[PDB]
Amino acid sequence: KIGNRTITLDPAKVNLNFQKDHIAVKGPLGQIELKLPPNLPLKFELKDNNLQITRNNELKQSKIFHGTYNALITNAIIGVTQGFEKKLRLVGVGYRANVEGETLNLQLGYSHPIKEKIPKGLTVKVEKNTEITISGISKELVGQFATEVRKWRKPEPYKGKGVLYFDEVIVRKAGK
Amino acid sequence: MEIRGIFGVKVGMSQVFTTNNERLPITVIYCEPNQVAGVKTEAKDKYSATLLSFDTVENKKLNKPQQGFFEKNNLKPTKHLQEIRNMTGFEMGQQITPQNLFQVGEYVDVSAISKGRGFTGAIKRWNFKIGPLGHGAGYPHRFQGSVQAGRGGASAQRVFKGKKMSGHYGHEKVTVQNLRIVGFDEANMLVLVSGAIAGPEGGVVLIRTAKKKPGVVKPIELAVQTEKAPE
Amino acid sequence: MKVRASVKPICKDCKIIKRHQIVRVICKTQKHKQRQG
């Protein structure tokens, strides 16, 4: 079960301030803020190097929240301590991207130039024109950037053209 | 938005030949210097507008309440008072002319009261079709069109609200948009506006910034005749 | 996606879920997407 899963964290640099509805996690990287919805059916306890989430009742939403927020705390700590990264393999005949200031521009196949603004806290690097790496401290934010970059050219099944994900296989078709 | 407005009187229609070889019909508007009679602010009133005074007249042709207001505000007596929404940035008691408002060839829209036509029929009013004239016919030739929606208790049994029938036509405010200013005449205080402006010659006319193309200014220049003295 | 009054798995990999109070079938094969269960 996720709810009854240990969250053993070292006190070297990661602290977790527990307010009424504002959980703050600070560590090597930037600080992550989590909002607690009101009347949360789960109380945290903060021992030495161990946090344990317990519930009051046997309700369905109680169990659902107990699992979900244990996962959220795990993800916040990991991103604060070591971050998250996503890899996009942009592949094609004339596809290439590069970064200018805060906007990532791409030229896949479109007459109109394609540009994209980078939100705060995320760093996107382009080592090779066919490769994009999105590094951040919040999993959902880097995932939104990866998917919104993908939306311009979804990988087609007939050839390999598109903004593929790394180690992602697509079903091949033979268009004679 | 930043809406600019001026008031004038339409004097007639003419044409001018322009470079790029076009013959442009124009409307001529006599624009008196307008006087800002009041400014109404968004914070103090819940909306923002500018009310000007124009078409100046002598004090003996004005009613007592209006002349009292004019003498209280220290303004020139005028018989016409009207405002435009979202007009800001003008100090009270400042003379405004279209030269400071619009550019040489920018897009503006014009509102004016249409020419009165009186009690007109359905065909002249709603672009309806006339009934057949030959092959046998009946008393109603210029018929409005059957207004039946449903006959019987399970159907409407009534003429629907907002039906298209005969009635009053004309003497109604109408706006024509995206009209390009052609030329300014400072000495005669005379504005040239391309196209046709509604209303009879001598009626009031409101020139406003076009909401469709607020900042668009399409260049236009006139042609200089090359003809010389007879040889 | 195929809209049918009755939805059942076609291959052993098809999995039934309930999303937005509607039961659908999702699977690796896109020819087997069903809805309106």
Partner: protein
């Protein structure tokens, strides 16, 4: 303004003396055809030594109009008879010569061959 079922003359060498309009090509309920417009027609008066036969349905472009049209400068071009020439898919004239004068509206809508084979353009 040539309209539906309008008899007009042919200003070329093809054997067709009188031609009748069938459709004002270009859109739905296109009421009239002005200078430069393309129409579908049927040959009604022809000659034995002609490339076309009576009754064929063909495509033509109008070059002259009695009503006339007004240009941008303000000049109103007005002929005294409605005339059309028979054209091919490529927009190339079917005849080898064009009789009489033609308008300038052809130049805008391509029809360069028609202008080069005319006597004088107006």
């Amino acid at each position: 303004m040539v309209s539906f079922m309008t008899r007009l003359n042919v200003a070329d060498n093809t054997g067709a003396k009188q031609v009748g309009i069938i459709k004002v090509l270009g859109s739905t309920r296109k009421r009239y055809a002005f200078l430069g417009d393309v129409v579908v027609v049927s040959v009604k008066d022809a000659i034995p030594s002609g490339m076309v036969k009576k009754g064929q349905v063909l495509r033509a472009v109008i070059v002259r109009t009695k009503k006339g049209q007004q240009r941008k400068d303000g000049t109103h071009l007005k002929f005294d008879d409605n005339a059309c020439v028979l054209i091919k898919e490529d927009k190339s004239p079917r005849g080898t010569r064009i009789f009489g004068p033609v308008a300038r509206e052809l130049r805008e809508r391509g029809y360069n061959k028609i202008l080069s084979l005319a006597v004088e353009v107006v």
